[PDB]
Enzyme design. Structure first.
Site, PDB file in Angstrom:
ATOM      1  N   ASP A   1      -0.284  -7.722   1.733  1.00  0.00           N
ATOM      2  CA  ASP A   1       0.667  -6.308   1.748  1.00  0.00           C
ATOM      3  C   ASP A   1       1.981  -6.371   1.953  1.00  0.00           C
ATOM      4  O   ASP A   1       2.570  -6.299   2.858  1.00  0.00           O
ATOM      5  CB  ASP A   1      -0.099  -5.523   2.781  1.00  0.00           C
ATOM      6  CG  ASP A   1       0.256  -4.255   2.664  1.00  0.00           C
ATOM      7  OD1 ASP A   1       0.669  -3.775   1.702  1.00  0.00           O
ATOM      8  OD2 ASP A   1      -0.083  -3.592   3.831  1.00  0.00           O
TER       9      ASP A   1
ATOM     10  N   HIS B   1       0.821  -1.115   0.098  1.00  0.00           N
ATOM     11  CA  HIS B   1       0.005   0.058  -0.086  1.00  0.00           C
ATOM     12  C   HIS B   1       0.768   1.334   0.009  1.00  0.00           C
ATOM     13  O   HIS B   1       0.256   2.473  -0.066  1.00  0.00           O
ATOM     14  CB  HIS B   1      -1.173  -0.130   1.185  1.00  0.00           C
ATOM     15  CG  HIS B   1      -0.504   0.138   2.585  1.00  0.00           C
ATOM     16  ND1 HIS B   1      -0.294  -0.803   3.497  1.00  0.00           N
ATOM     17  CD2 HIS B   1      -0.057   1.315   3.377  1.00  0.00           C
ATOM     18  CE1 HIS B   1       0.314  -0.265   4.370  1.00  0.00           C
ATOM     19  NE2 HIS B   1       0.047   1.082   4.403  1.00  0.00           N
TER      20      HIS B   1
ATOM     21  N   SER C   1       4.296   2.500   8.076  1.00  0.00           N
ATOM     22  CA  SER C   1       3.790   1.406   7.185  1.00  0.00           C
ATOM     23  C   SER C   1       5.072   1.285   6.157  1.00  0.00           C
ATOM     24  O   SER C   1       5.798   1.894   5.874  1.00  0.00           O
ATOM     25  CB  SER C   1       2.676   2.037   6.192  1.00  0.00           C
ATOM     26  OG  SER C   1       1.421   1.455   6.664  1.00  0.00           O
ATOM     27  N   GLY C   2       5.126  -0.296   6.190  1.00  0.00           N
ATOM     28  CA  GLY C   2       6.188  -0.833   5.263  1.00  0.00           C
ATOM     29  C   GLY C   2       7.536  -0.926   6.112  1.00  0.00           C
ATOM     30  O   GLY C   2       8.440  -1.741   5.530  1.00  0.00           O
TER      31      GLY C   2
END
Ligand SMILES: [Ca+2]
Lengths: 215, 56
Positions: free
Chosen positions: A84, A40, A169-170
């Site tokens: 994801d 994402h 995120s990530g």
């Protein structure tokens, strides 16, 4: 705040910042030419910044490298967030040193209860750290009825108080020297009964290795 | 104007930090907010011009 503490400068050498004009996601360096992050976090143009501590000041040990290839998992679902995960190949190999290093991919899936280290600029200026355990699937499932797949794992505290948040995120979840999770999603941040959900990296080791060898 | 323009900005469950625009009724204009990267609601624009065109 999200409850973490400022990491000791360059104590998380595999941490990277994804930048497209500003910091928007984190990531992990797994070898000198590849970074793993969340799907994402996809953007057509991404600059990877390595060796960072304070992302707002030029400190001297940073390496700026453009993404050459961005490969999301072929089965990523934008709605459910299943699979994801995404790989980024850098334009050129980075110089590995004490402030810029790689993190090992999992040898196997870590069991619930394993203490891990979550990092990110999330909440951004200084890199934040959080020590938290992998939670049992049953607890993860109870917190997010019908939303958890076998490719996800909850990490954190059911009482809330500590968690990863937007901007994280990530980023990596490292346990015993291996990358076991990728910051993905959650309902709010640090909310009781809603710990963060992370992509379970051990389910993708072969996909990662196969993809790197072919690209 | 459309009802979704009067809804508060929606960050979503994902934890990215993406700056988007949303129409602020109380202020009568489009401002910025942090979008998480997934499950955007309609009061979420990549630009102020699109935000104002759609919700003005
Ligand atoms: Ca810096």
């Amino acid at each position: 705040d999200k409850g973490g503490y400022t990491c000791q400068e360059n104590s998380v050498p595999y941490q990277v910042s994804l930048n497209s004009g500003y910091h928007f996601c984190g990531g992990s360096l797994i070898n000198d030419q590849w970074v793993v992050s969340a799907a994402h976090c996809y953007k057509s143009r991404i600059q990877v910044r390595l060796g960072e501590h304070n992302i707002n000041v030029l400190e001297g040990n940073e390496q700026f490298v453009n993404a050459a290839k961005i490969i999301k998992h072929p089965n990523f679902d934008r709605k459910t967030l299943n699979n994801d995960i995404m790989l980024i190949k850098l334009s050129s190999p980075v110089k590995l040193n004490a402030r810029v290093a790689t993190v090992a991919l999992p040898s196997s899936c870590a069991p619930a209860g394993t203490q891990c280290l979550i990092s990110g600029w999330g909440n951004p200026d200084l890199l934040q750290c959080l020590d938290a355990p992998l939670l049992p699937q049953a607890d993860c499932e109870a917190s997010y009825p019908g939303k958890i797949t076998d490719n996800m794992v909850c990490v954190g505290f059911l009482e809330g108080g500590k968690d990863s948040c937007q901007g994280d995120s990530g980023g990596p979840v490292v346990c015993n020297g291996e990358l076991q999770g990728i910051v993905s999603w959650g309902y709010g941040c640090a909310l009781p009964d809603n710990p963060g959900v992370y992509t379970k990296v051990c389910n993708y080791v072969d996909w990662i290795q196969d993809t790197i060898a072919a690209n | 104007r459309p009802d979704f323009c009067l809804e508060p900005p929606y960050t979503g469950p994902c934890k990215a930090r993406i700056i988007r625009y949303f129409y602020n009724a109380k202020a009568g204009l489009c401002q910025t907010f942090v979008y998480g990267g997934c499950r955007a609601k309609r009061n979420n624009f990549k630009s102020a011009e699109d935000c104002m065109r759609t919700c003005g």
